[PDB]
């Protein structure tokens, strides 16, 4: 079958992050944080059609023995079923450790890279992730990193099969539980 992803996004200043972490520890499940660290690449294939194909590939620099991960995300749906979150079509694949060579030989070209570092939380079927984006220059090395801004980014995500109503409502309630600190909205990828 096909799956769908519902998304909500926001940001927080980094001089008040401890209070947000304490609140998320108090609200989420009784599980210790993970502190992930991932490298990310974006591949683009430009054919005859105007819109090029785009794929994302991730890798874990912290835990050895974790397979690579592909991801493809389609255009957001304009249908008026759920109107409080980004609803998109997602396909995710676990792949062996020669992904770049095969993707290059199909015809894809790399576009840009970044490194993300942050924390991860689970609540029911909801995924909270709070991370900071870095910048990679001199693309051969992965130690030439500088911070991009003065704020962390916060994501609320739920992945579920098609249909499956009364999910955005629970996401709205959980977002409103965090209103005095972070303000999460539906925002379009365009500007």
């Amino acid at each position: 079958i096909n799956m769908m992803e519902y998304l909500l996004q926001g940001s927080v200043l980094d001089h008040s992050l401890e209070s947000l972490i304490h609140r998320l520890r108090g609200l989420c499940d009784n599980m210790e944080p993970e502190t992930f660290l991932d490298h990310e690449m974006v591949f683009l294939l430009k054919g005859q059609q105007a819109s090029p194909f785009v794929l994302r590939a991730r890798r874990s620099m912290d835990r050895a023995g974790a397979p690579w991960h592909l991801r493809y995300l389609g255009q957001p749906e304009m249908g008026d079923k759920n109107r409080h979150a980004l609803v998109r079509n997602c396909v995710d694949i676990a792949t062996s450790e020669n992904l770049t060579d095969f993707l290059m030989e199909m015809g894809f070209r790399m576009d840009h890279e970044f490194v993300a570092k942050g924390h991860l939380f689970r609540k029911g079927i909801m995924k909270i992730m709070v991370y900071k984006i870095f910048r990679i220059l001199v693309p051969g090395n992965t130690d030439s990193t500088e911070a991009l801004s003065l704020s962390y980014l916060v994501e609320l995500s739920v992945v579920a099969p098609a249909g499956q109503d009364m999910v955005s409502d629970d996401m709205k309630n959980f977002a409103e539980q965090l209103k005095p600190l972070v303000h999460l909205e539906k925002i379009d990828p365009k500007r």
Partner: protein, 58 residues
Amino acid sequence: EAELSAQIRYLTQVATGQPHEGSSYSSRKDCQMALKRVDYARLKLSDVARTCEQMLEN
């Protein structure tokens, strides 16, 4: 009045209206298990002690 007003503001920044469902029960069960395991050991040791005690004495 200064102190009370400041305290109210602090509460206005720390209040969320949810029950906070963390807890510490598992580690406490594990520690209780370990204590009664040691107690078992102490009982069996005393019994062996008395049978050796009675054999050494004729």
